[PDB]
Design a protein around this ligand. Structure first.
Ligand SMILES: O=C(O)[C@@](O)(COP(=O)(O)O)[C@H](O)[C@H](O)COP(=O)(O)O
Ligand SMILES: [Mg+2]
Lengths: 138, 480, 138, 138
């Protein structure tokens, strides 16, 4: 399956040129940019791993593209995403998040159901990738 | 190319795309109305170039099952039954491009006992449709089978008169003034003076809830003291409408329970709390032997203009169903809008067990009330005892006549103001009951009573020539 | 004090001619009429004593006026009222009730107060007339 | 194990002629027919995957048999069912649902138990087939 988290995941995997244009957009809005990665694709895995610190007050897209390449050398077998953050009062949140790397094969999720009171059930999303330990998932 | 493309619906009605609402099943001039159907009458003003039947069919569709493009999922349902039908579309008299659209809705479209659900369908989206530049809901036929799912008034006028031990005349009341600013103790003073001087009720103003200048608990406490003082002074049952209107249901309940604990015969609520809180209070009032007065705050935002909104008679129906015991319904001669024939329609909608069609009064549907209790109409705003003959004639015997300014504005005090109103009322009632032409003789009937009532003499001298003569906005389309 | 229960108690005590006109009105509406009396003036004394049965299907006001006089012979020292009842479905209640006799002196009521929780009080209306037994009140 | 969801699952797998006779029956009642498939055999998997749209107002059984065949070709290894729907008011539901394809081997379910309060337990039905990702189950 295709993991459709991220702003552009119904479009094909973005080229480096497409990614650079999104980085240029973020820079033009004075947003901070960071890079994160994970091998737990759970929809509520809120804290993907940090690739260094966020880049604040960025003038040059090439600095971001360099770190994207550097992160890919270590983690191109798993998920990598680019986030943009706006610290304007009343936002103070992520304002853009898109996937830049995916595993070659994502097996996706088992929907787990348990019987509960009357007709109610409890549900869990089990990642098939997480059947194996970190480092052996993808 | 795929299985989705292969299994597409070829049927002309259910193939994809936009087709007129009048060709989707929402126009049927041969539809046979069932006695279980909910009927609505809309005044429809289409945009230039829009066909009147198509506009009417759009209202029918978008208040029942339709959207703007065809959907195959219709066929999972008994769609022929669930579609509403515009079944009669007529020109409104003396207009160029305005129509009466009669629309039928099956009883199964609606949640039992829910004003929120009824209104979600009938008024939810259709008033904002680009294709109609104006739309007004004029009347509805609520069938007996749907009415039986509602409580109706908690108390009703019959039980209300029994609790008060007051028969054969209007009730009297008064809103405390100034509207805002009085303390709890001063509120109690006004209530004591008004009740002790002759009024049956006083009331909190609609905007008197709990505020920096007066918190609600002291007002209720002083008010019940004033009430009980006045009962001991007169030997009459008396009441003050303690306003329990509040931001949340929990706060409203806290206020209603406190009023109950003090032993008030009556509380009030404002229409601005909304339909679900009103229904909740209607049930609470039945459970707790409480008269529930509804002030219609905000009603004129949608009820004033003839071409657009909701006519008040429909609101009368919904609030009677919801379980209120009083509702404000007009004075004719006071400071607020009130054509006499429209008002007659409102009062009849609230009080009668059954209504026949009466086009001059704006009653478009025969309405069986299914033995639901009766709502006491309330005549309030800018009225005075010099009009008592007109009030008794226009408004009848079953009403609360409320004189706020007309009591508290009396130069000799609040008791004097109350006494003037009470004497004026009884003088007019006794004259009516004796068979006298009390409308023609009314000013003289009041003068005669004033000969032995100083307070009434003064009130007549002060206000007798005060009138509010303006052209009505809300008027009939037919005459007798 | 003047007990202001009844439809016309802010007007002077009604003459026999005024009373007959109210009876005529009731007859013209096909209302049943009855006569009741009491020596407990409490505002919630719901059941005043019956003077005979109500008169149903009344053609003649003089029959009612006769019973008014007869009741007065026995009870003119206390309260007497005339009621009219309408048994039309949806009414089935009293539709007119007015006082036709009063005691010469009504002492009225003591307002009794009791302390309750916080600032709340409990109230009672004590009739001064009821300080004496029935037969000795007025 | 044999999954015994469906109207006829205690009988042998239906022949094409048996299936056609059920289709004719549904057509004779003016029922709408649809075809659905799944690789999650859970008893509370309410929403099997749709094979196209339901066929409404059907004249011809051969047309339904074609789509039955076409679904079977694309999903020969998993479950496939035929449903008939009646939109008459007061029914507005499925009125016939039977299996027309099953996997060659169904491993079935593990009954999962958890300890709860006093002697109460919580239960879950775990499908062995769902130990693998979609597309690799059967
Ligand atoms: O706030 C006011 O104006 C009143 O208290 C009247 O005061 P006065 O008696 O001093 O005029 C009433 O709420 C209005 O009559 C409501 O209008 P309606 O009955 O039309 O809803
Ligand atoms: Mg007000």
């Amino acid at each position: 399956m295709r993991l459709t988290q991220g702003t552009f995941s119904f479009l094909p995997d973005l080229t480096d040129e497409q990614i650079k244009k999104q980085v240029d957009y973020a820079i033009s809005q004075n947003w901070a940019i960071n890079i994160e990665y994970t091998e737990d694709p759970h929809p509520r895995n809120n804290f993907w791993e940090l690739w260094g610190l966020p880049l604040f007050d960025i003038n040059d897209a090439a600095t971001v593209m360099y770190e994207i390449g550097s992160c890919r050398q270590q983690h191109s077998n798993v998920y990598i995403k680019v986030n943009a953050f706006d610290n304007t009062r009343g936002v103070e949140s992520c304002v853009l998040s898109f996937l830049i790397n995916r595993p070659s094969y994502e097996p996706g999720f088992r929907l787990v159901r348990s019987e509960d009171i009357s007709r109610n059930q409890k549900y869990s999303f089990h990642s098939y990738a997480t059947d194996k330990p970190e480092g052996s998932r993808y | 190319n795929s299985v989705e493309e292969r299994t597409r619906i070829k049927n002309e009605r259910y193939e994809s795309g936009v087709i007129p609402y009048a060709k989707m099943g929402y126009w049927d001039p041969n539809y046979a109305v069932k006695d279980t159907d909910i009927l609505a009458l809309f005044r429809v003003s289409p945009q230039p170039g829009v066909d009147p039947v198509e506009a009417s069919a759009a209202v029918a569709g978008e208040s029942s099952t339709a959207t703007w493009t065809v959907v195959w999922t219709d066929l999972l349902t008994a769609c022929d039954l669930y579609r509403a039908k515009a079944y009669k579309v007529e020109s409104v008299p003396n207009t160029s491009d305005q129509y009466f659209a009669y629309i039928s809705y099956d009883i199964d479209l609606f949640e039992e006992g829910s004003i929120a659900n009824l209104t979600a369908s009938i008024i939810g989206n259709v008033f904002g449709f680009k294709a109609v530049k104006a739309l007004r809901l004029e009347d509805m036929r609520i069938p007996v089978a749907y009415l039986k799912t509602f409580q109706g008034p908690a108390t009703g006028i019959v039980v209300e008169r029994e609790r008060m031990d007051k028969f054969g005349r209007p009730f009297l009341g008064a809103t405390v003034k100034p509207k805002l600013g009085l303390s709890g103790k001063n509120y109690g003073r006004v209530v004591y003076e008004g009740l002790r001087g002759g009024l049956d009720f006083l009331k909190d103003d609609e905007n008197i809830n709990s505020q920096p200048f007066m918190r609600w608990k002291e007002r209720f406490l002083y008010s019940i003291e004033a009430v009980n003082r006045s009962i001991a002074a007169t030997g009459e049952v008396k009441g003050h409408y303690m306003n329990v209107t509040a931001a949340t249901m929990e706060e409203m309940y806290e206020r209603a329970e406190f009023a109950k604990q003090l032993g008030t015969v009556i509380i009030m609520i404002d229409l601005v709390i909304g339909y679900t809180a009103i229904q909740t209070m209607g049930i609470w009032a039945r459970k707790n032997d409480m008269i529930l007065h509804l002030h219609r705050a905000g009603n004129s935002t949608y009820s004033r203009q003839k071409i657009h909104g909701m006519n008040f008679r429909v609101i009368c129906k919904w609030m009677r169903m919801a379980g209120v015991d009083h509702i404000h319904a007009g004075t004719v001669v006071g400071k607020l809008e009130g054509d006499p024939l429209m008002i007659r329609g409102f009062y009849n909608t609230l009080l009668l067990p059954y209504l026949e069609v009466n086009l001059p009064q704006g009653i478009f549907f025969q309405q069986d009330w299914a033995s639901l209790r009766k709502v006491t109409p309330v005549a309030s705003g800018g009225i005075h005892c010099g009009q008592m003959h007109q009030l008794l004639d226009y408004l009848g015997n079953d009403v609360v006549l409320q004189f706020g300014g007309g009591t508290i504005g009396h130069p000799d005090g609040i008791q004097a103001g109350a006494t003037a109103n009470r004497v004026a009322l009884e003088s007019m009632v006794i004259a009516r009951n004796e068979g006298r032409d009390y409308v023609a003789e009314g000013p003289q009937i009041l003068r005669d009573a004033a000969k032995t009532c100083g307070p009434l003499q003064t009130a007549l001298d002060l206000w007798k020539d005060i009138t509010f003569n303006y052209t009505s906005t809300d008027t009939a389309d037919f005459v007798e």
